[PDB]
């Protein structure tokens, strides 16, 4: 009784506390202002903004929820511009987006069959049923798709369909169907075994029905991965050309993709550095590669970003958007808002923010530059590019502090050749046992 | 030298002061917020708003820059509604507005002739030239017009012309002409005397030219003051009627105006109470009545407002708009904004605010109700009505505190019969010598 | 521009206090005192007032101090709050000058407290610039060719060394037909920095 009493909200206590807080001038000022405006609008610190909104970067690349696909295909887009002397060029994101969604719906049916032994109310089965066709993904999922499907110019398959730019309704219609199929499969698996002719036939009818519904909202791409397409275009000089190629040959011959060089490093302080981290079950293409990260410290993660940028290549990275991100000015700085002035401070550290459900990776973006300090020999800020129209931020360009990178970013993607042999070996040796995390881990899919 | 040095802005001092202010938390909070938002938007105190925005009034009237004319004609408008059993009705403001402007332009020419002895750069002549045709006025100026012109229903002469609702350009064109005429008159008065045939002819040609330019922007009313008009209308029951009347007979017979009963009281602490105050030269109709106020204390001014409201009549009053007036919520309260929380306090008293160019009468409005405290026997707040469309305030309705009335209001208009004999006598006795103030005094014309 | 705008406003508020002390002998309702009280902190100025500020404060690149604050692009409310205070200070000064003389220790202290209070209120709406006129700033920039550079300079050295200002060459000519041509015209009292140059025109 005494415990529950002490643990209850006591009316005299809160009114006494109120009287005490109301006697403080800062508090009186703060509650006047915070009843009138959104705290971020009210506390944005222009004095800090003045110093941090710096768009001078001495280390830049020379060139100029589906974000993960725009960020992932960017370099390949640049390789084509260069290889073909183009003025402008876009790879088709819709191409990858259509197959990702089909594969994910197909993947879910397999996840359901493999988890059929578990109770319908189990944590995994409910988790599988929550959002089987979400638009986000990881870099490994992007490579799984390019290895099977290749890449094609946006001119052959663009963002024309309604659902390519407003996928919410489409996903909901598919998901409702997938939830029905989950029950139908689990129900048929009570009697028959999975290899049973009936389950095999049922799974195929389901693939058919998923494909049929998808074909209503988006067309299947115009050519198969090994089928040739003819593409007419104009180079920087107004000269015309025709390329005959297949999607697969195109990803390699023109976009120069070598799927075996990309590796993802991550700063996840919940785990020891030097270890490989694998997210169980997270995927898109059945039988494709797993999401694997090599865990490293921020110093290491920062040097790698600088080295890649020095090799004139942008860096794919994942972070917690939109934590401490000001879209209006395009600034990512954890001290840009004056919360300490209202006594609001946040001591919880990175590893704990992750464990306690406060911070996770949510979006993928591109680092295209940085500023390394002459004195010292370290990065101070990074130039970041988003896929949110030329209107978000400074014409879509953001500036991010080193501290933001350390605290609210986690993963970067680099080529294994850019790593020190001691780290590259972690991937090639075949001796590392990864730490295996649940499918629902915060270090997952990116928008 | 030491004086000028001590009196200069010293860079070390202001930077030292800055360091001291920046060490205070309230200050740090305040400069963050005040660089982001307008101080009134930021400091509006909703906690105070919650208590002061009270629209319950136990003392209300039973009925339901040209504001001074809408406020001035309102009662007469109600008298007509009642006298004719009308559902809706408006007196024509444009009627009064057209003659006010003509008379004012004519008045200016006379002010110029009477001040011709003074230098062109004198304070009075420059003041006369500043805004000879402004739209604002005083209650005496309103009576000067009704006594000569009468009143007509809005149905016969409405706010149709562009310049009746956007008079800025019209006034500027007239004023430019009037400034030319001022020189032409002063120039002709160097040789000839004012009664000289030539000056008389010149003044008439100027009246003609003013009238001609005015007739381009607004038509002269359709009937003369003693000429009959025919007005067709429908009463509350959908029954039709025709009234044949002249503007003058109409102001008296239907709108029930008796120009000899209205008197204006004012609270001007710069002067002793019990004295009559006259604003020199301020007028519209040449030879009409002067602007005269009987100076009284706030207790007296407040009791008179209550008494008039008890006689079921609204009260014309002048105040300093928009000091401490929140248009969005429709509240007039000098403590509604939390300026003390940023250390901004204003000790300067009423009489001093007036002398030091900080507060003056600027607009005329209507008090249509008030709340007198059961305990005590005094008014707590007033219901105020503005002529700013149903969109300003609470459907055009404001609530004003007793303190606001005391500090930022000055004049009210009442019937001499409502005054205590000791005050009424101040007007009838013929023994009072008014304190005479300059034409540029803050206790002047209202918008 | 905000750099110059912040000091112009501070100096003007400071200037007004001095105009009030020097006109204290005149009646509160006199033409000059009422004129002084009308708009002591208006945003406008003359070229001489601009030179008075550059000579004392110098110039800095907009990248170090921009038009970020609300009041830099909508100064009406800020000016009104300052002006209301300045009108209160005018009375407090004239009232204290009835007894004591201007050099009196009390008037000197009072004037300083007023400067302090003006500066404090201004610092709520705009920050004092990041460096003093003789203090060095570091400025990073990119030239037409995408090459990066860092300039270390003080605001004063910057107005001269990079912006090439020589405050002694600018002169203002005017066509004012009210007066004879060939004459110099001086506008009495019009200024911003106490003791700075007067507004003078050659007609």
């Amino acid at each position: 009784f005494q415990g529950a009493m002490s643990s209850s909200i006591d009316i005299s206590k809160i009114n006494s506390w109120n009287k005490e807080f109301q006697s403080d001038l800062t508090h009186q000022l703060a509650t006047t202002v915070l009843k009138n405006y959104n705290a971020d609008d009210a506390l944005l610190n222009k004095t800090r903004l003045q110093k941090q909104d710096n768009r001078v970067f001495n280390t830049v690349v020379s060139t100029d929820g589906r974000c993960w696909l725009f960020a992932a295909t960017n370099q390949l887009r640049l390789n084509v511009l260069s290889e073909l002397n183009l003025k402008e060029f876009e790879l088709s994101q819709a191409y990858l987006f259509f197959y990702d969604k089909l594969e994910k719906a197909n993947y879910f049916l397999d996840q359901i069959v493999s988890s059929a032994d578990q109770d319908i109310d189990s944590r995994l089965v409910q988790y599988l049923l929550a959002a089987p066709t979400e638009d986000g993904g990881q870099y490994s999922m992007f490579l799984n798709l390019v290895k099977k499907y290749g890449l094609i110019p946006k001119d052959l398959y663009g963002d024309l369909p309604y659902s390519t730019t407003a996928s919410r309704k489409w996903n909901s219609l598919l998901t409702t169907k997938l939830r029905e199929f989950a029950e139908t499969l689990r129900t048929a698996l009570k009697e028959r075994s999975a290899d049973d002719s009936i389950i095999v036939t049922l799974r195929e009818q389901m693939q058919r029905e998923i494909f049929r519904l998808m074909s209503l909202f988006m067309d299947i791409p115009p050519v198969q991965p090994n089928e040739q397409f003819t593409w007419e275009y104009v180079d920087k000089d107004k000269k015309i050309h025709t390329i005959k190629s297949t999607p697969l040959e195109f990803a390699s011959k023109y976009a120069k993709l070598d799927p075996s060089t990309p590796v993802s490093l991550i700063n996840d302080p919940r785990h020891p550095y030097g270890k490989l981290i694998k997210i169980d079950r997270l995927g898109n293409v059945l039988g494709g590669d797993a999401v694997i990260y090599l865990n490293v410290d921020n110093e290491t993660l920062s040097k790698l970003v600088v080295k890649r940028l020095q090799n004139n290549k942008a860096v794919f990275f994942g972070s917690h958007t939109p934590k401490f991100m000001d879209k209006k000015t395009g600034v990512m700085d954890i001290e840009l808002w004056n919360y300490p002035a209202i006594g609001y401070n946040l001591p919880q550290q990175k590893a704990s923010r992750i464990r306690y459900h406060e911070s996770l990776m949510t979006h993928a973006m591109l680092i295209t530059g940085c500023h390394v300090d002459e004195t010292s020999k370290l990065p101070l800020r990074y130039r970041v590019e988003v896929s949110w129209g030329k209107d978000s931020g400074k014409d879509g360009l953001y500036v991010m502090t080193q501290k933001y990178f350390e605290e609210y970013c986690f993963q970067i993607v680099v080529d294994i050749n850019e790593l020190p042999k001691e780290l590259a070996s972690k991937f090639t040796s075949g001796k590392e046992e990864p730490i295996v995390l649940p499918i629902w881990d915060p270090m997952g899919a990116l928008a």
Side-chain angles (χ1 to χ4, degrees), chain A residues 1-5 7-447:
Chain A
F1 176 64
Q2 300 178 349
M5 208 70 166
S7 298
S8 296
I9 285 301
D10 182 79
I11 298 174
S12 168
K13 295 197 200 178
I14 58 174
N15 275 270
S16 300
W17 289 338
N18 189 63
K19 179 176 166 69
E20 183 180 324
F21 305 142
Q22 274 299 313
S23 83
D24 183 75
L25 242 300
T26 308
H27 189 89
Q28 289 177 51
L29 176 49
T31 186
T32 297
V33 173
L34 300 181
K35 280 193 291 290
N36 296 332
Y37 292 112
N38 174 105
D40 284 336
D41 293 329
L43 304 172
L44 175 105
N45 189 170
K46 278 168 180 175
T47 302
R48 169 82 179 183
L49 208 221
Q50 182 65 248
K51 314 161 308 84
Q52 307 293 140
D53 198 353
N54 186 331
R55 318 291 184 134
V56 164
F57 299 99
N58 60 20
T59 303
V60 294
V61 150
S62 64
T63 310
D64 300 325
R66 305 187 308 155
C67 283
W68 62 298
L69 299 162
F70 297 67
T73 55
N74 184 66
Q75 185 61 55
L76 312 183
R77 185 273 258 55
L78 281 30
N79 297 350
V80 176
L81 261 177
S82 159
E83 187 62 17
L84 300 179
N85 186 58
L86 305 182
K87 190 180 169 186
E88 286 164 56
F89 179 80
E90 283 186 276
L91 285 165
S92 166
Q93 278 74 50
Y95 184 72
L96 297 178
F97 176 57
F98 177 95
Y99 295 124
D100 183 46
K101 193 172 300 307
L102 218 200
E103 294 281 349
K104 287 176 173 162
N106 180 61
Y107 196 79
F108 163 85
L109 300 175
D110 189 79
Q111 288 291 295
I112 292 298
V113 166
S114 77
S115 67
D117 56 312
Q118 309 201 222
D119 196 307
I120 181 46
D121 42 49
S122 56
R123 181 169 198 194
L124 177 60
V125 177
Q126 285 299 307
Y127 184 81
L128 290 174
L129 295 164
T133 73
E134 289 311 2
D135 299 0
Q138 253 301 321
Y139 201 91
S140 65
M141 292 167 59
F142 159 67
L143 288 178
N144 287 343
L145 299 161
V146 196
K147 286 163 138 186
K148 183 172 176 168
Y149 299 103
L151 298 164
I152 61 171
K154 181 176 193 181
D155 303 325
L156 301 186
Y157 189 73
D159 298 74
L160 299 188
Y162 171 79
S163 296
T164 73
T165 52
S167 64
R168 183 183 348 289
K169 185 59 190 188
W170 190 24
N171 280 322
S172 168
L173 290 171
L174 285 171
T175 291
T176 290
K177 264 286 150 189
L178 292 173
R179 282 166 182 155
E180 169 201 315
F181 289 172
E183 174 183 36
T184 299
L185 284 177
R186 284 167 62 82
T187 293
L189 284 161
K190 273 171 189 63
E191 339 101 292
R192 295 174 232 50
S193 139
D195 53 72
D196 184 319
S197 182
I198 292 169
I199 304 304
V200 179
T201 292
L202 193 55
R203 292 179 65 166
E204 185 174 70
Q205 297 171 333
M206 285 170 172
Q207 291 189 333
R208 191 171 178 287
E209 197 69 345
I210 288 162
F211 180 71
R212 183 201 137 241
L213 293 168
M214 281 189 59
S215 76
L216 293 187
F217 298 83
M218 278 185 82
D219 303 320
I220 185 174
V223 299
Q224 290 173 49
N226 286 283
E227 175 178 20
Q228 293 179 311
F229 61 73
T230 294
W231 172 51
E232 291 178 309
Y233 69 92
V234 187
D235 54 39
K236 311 187 160 202
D237 307 314
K238 302 293 196 308
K239 300 291 75 180
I240 281 58
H241 303 281
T242 302
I243 277 173
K244 193 175 60 185
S245 181
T246 68
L248 282 165
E249 177 207 311
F250 192 86
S252 168
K253 175 173 181 64
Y254 296 91
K256 321 298 186 174
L257 190 173
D258 181 341
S260 74
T261 74
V263 289
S264 289
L265 292 278
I266 199 177
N267 181 247
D268 172 8
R270 288 176 303 172
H271 301 105
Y273 296 136
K275 228 97 189 324
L276 243 36
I277 291 178
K278 173 170 172 289
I279 303 308
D280 181 51
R281 293 172 174 263
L282 175 54
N284 55 350
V285 178
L286 175 59
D289 312 303
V291 173
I292 289 284
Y293 312 115
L294 168 54
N295 197 23
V296 308
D297 67 35
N298 274 158
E299 170 184 47
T300 296
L301 204 77
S302 293
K303 283 174 178 182
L304 288 176
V305 176
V306 168
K307 173 175 184 151
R308 175 169 260 264
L309 288 169
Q310 274 162 175
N311 287 323
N312 197 44
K313 281 175 181 187
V315 188
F316 175 110
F317 77 107
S319 59
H320 186 178
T321 287
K323 270 277 161 199
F324 299 110
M325 172 185 288
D326 188 58
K327 309 199 169 188
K328 183 60 181 73
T329 62
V331 171
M332 299 154 79
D333 172 4
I334 73 184
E335 296 185 63
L336 186 61
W337 291 266
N338 208 347
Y339 281 93
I342 58 167
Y344 182 90
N345 298 288
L346 298 176
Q348 183 165 60
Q349 296 195 299
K350 195 175 184 174
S352 292
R353 280 173 241 148
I354 298 171
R355 281 190 250 258
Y356 281 76
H357 209 303
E358 173 54 23
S359 191
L360 71 176
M361 283 196 289
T362 65
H363 291 253
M365 291 177 295
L366 239 35
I367 288 163
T368 66
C370 78
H371 197 72
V372 182
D373 188 76
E374 191 172 295
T375 319
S376 103
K377 276 204 189 195
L378 316 144
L380 307 176
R381 67 191 90 125
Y382 303 83
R383 188 180 60 179
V384 174
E385 199 180 273
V386 306
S387 67
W388 296 326
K390 69 297 174 181
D391 289 304
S392 190
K394 184 170 193 188
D395 287 309
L397 246 60
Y398 284 56
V399 54
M400 170 186 260
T401 68
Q402 173 58 28
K403 200 62 159 71
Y404 184 103
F405 176 67
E406 291 170 359
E407 301 305 313
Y408 290 95
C409 291
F410 307 92
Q411 158 197 29
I412 63 173
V413 173
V414 308
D415 295 318
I416 187 155
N417 270 20
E418 281 167 331
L419 294 182
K421 179 65 178 181
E422 307 91 352
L423 291 180
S425 68
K426 300 280 179 186
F427 285 109
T428 60
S429 105
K431 163 61 186 179
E432 287 306 314
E433 205 153 52
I435 300 193
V436 169
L437 307 189
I439 184 184
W440 54 74
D441 195 85
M443 293 297 105
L446 311 177

